[PDB]
Amino acid sequence: SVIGRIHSFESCGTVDGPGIRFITFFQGCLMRCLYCHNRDTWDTHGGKEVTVEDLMKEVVTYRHFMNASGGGVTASGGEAILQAEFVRDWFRACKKEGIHTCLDTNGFVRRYDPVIDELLEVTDLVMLDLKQMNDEIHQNLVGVSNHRTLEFAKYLANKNVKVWIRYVVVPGWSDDDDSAHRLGEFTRDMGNVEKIELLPYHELGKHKWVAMGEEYKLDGVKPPKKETMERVKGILEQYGHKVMF
Numbered sequence: 312s313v314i315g316r317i318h319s320f321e322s323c324g325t326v327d328g329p330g331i332r333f334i335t336f337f338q339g340c341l342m343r344c345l346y347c348h349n350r351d352t353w354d355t356h357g358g359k360e361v362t363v364e365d366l367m368k369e370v371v372t373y374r375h376f377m378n379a380s381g382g383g384v385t386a387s388g389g390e391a392i393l394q395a396e397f398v399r400d401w402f403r404a405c406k407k408e409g410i411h412t413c414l415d416t417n418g419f420v421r422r423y424d425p426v427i428d429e430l431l432e433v434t435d436l437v438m439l440d441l442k443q444m445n446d447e448i449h450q451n452l453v454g455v456s457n458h459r460t461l462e463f464a465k466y467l468a469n470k471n472v473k474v475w476i477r478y479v480v481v482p483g484w485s486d487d488d489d490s491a492h493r494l495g496e497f498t499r500d501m502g503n504v505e506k507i508e509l510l511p512y513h514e515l516g517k518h519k520w521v522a523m524g525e526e527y528k529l530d531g532v533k534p535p536k537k538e539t540m541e542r543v544k545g546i547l548e549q550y551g552h553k554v555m556f
């Protein structure tokens with residue numbers, strides 16, 4: 312029945328645990344972050360066609376490695392939530408195999424049909440990218456308003472879904488102190504954020520823009536100052552957050 316469109320899949324040791332995570336990067340994203348790591352995930356009509364059956368046969372070989380703490384599967388890519396029906400089925404097949412499931416998303420949910428709730432029932436962890444609390448800047452950095460992502464976040468809180476937050480720090484855009492406080496405050500109130508990951512801006516994936524003959528509006532911006540990272544981090548910890556930077 313449901314077929315999925317993916318950019319790729321790779322197994323990888325979870326940043327902090329002995330387990331391995333099988334990560335499937337779903338094809339397609341409606342955002343256009345100036346710093347996008349892989350713009351090749353943008354096209355919703357690209358990638359490869361795979362069935363739930365196909366992915367599970369790829370995850371099995373890694374089974375022994377997923378029963379270790381952070382071991383499990385992750386739906387990432389561009390925006391995995393755009394293919395919410397398939398991810399639901401994938402996660403359902405994984406749940407019966409005794410596998411931990413993580414939904415890595417930007418939360419750019421357009422409509423709130425029941426499939427989302429179904430998806431969450433079989434989602435052990437939601438990794439939410441919060442790109443910018445100041446919508447003025449968010450529009451300029453991403454190309455869309457953060458309103459939907461923000462509603463989605465509140466949606467997850469009211470459901471008591473365990474959430475980790477990811478925030479990309481970029482000098483001149485998200486290094487602002489007023490923005491760190493807005494983020495720390497907002498996530499504090501959600502009440503379900505268990506940890507925040509601070510990622511310093513990186514000019515990686517730039518060859519994907521130039522390759523497709525496109526202009527990168529951040530080729531002149533450099534990573535954030537080691538001190539600046541400590542600044543925002545310290546600000547977020549004031550709201551009672553574990554910042555795993």
Ligand SMILES: CC[S@@+](C)CC[C@H](N)C(=O)O
Pocket residue numbers: 340348387388389390415416417440
């Ligand atoms: C840039 C960090 S990645 C682990 C996630 C990139 C983007 N938010 C995505 O989920 O497609």
Ligand code: SF4
Pocket residue numbers: 340341342343344346347348349350352388389390417
């Ligand atoms: S949400 Fe992720 S995949 Fe989509 S444009 Fe932004 S960085 Fe790229």
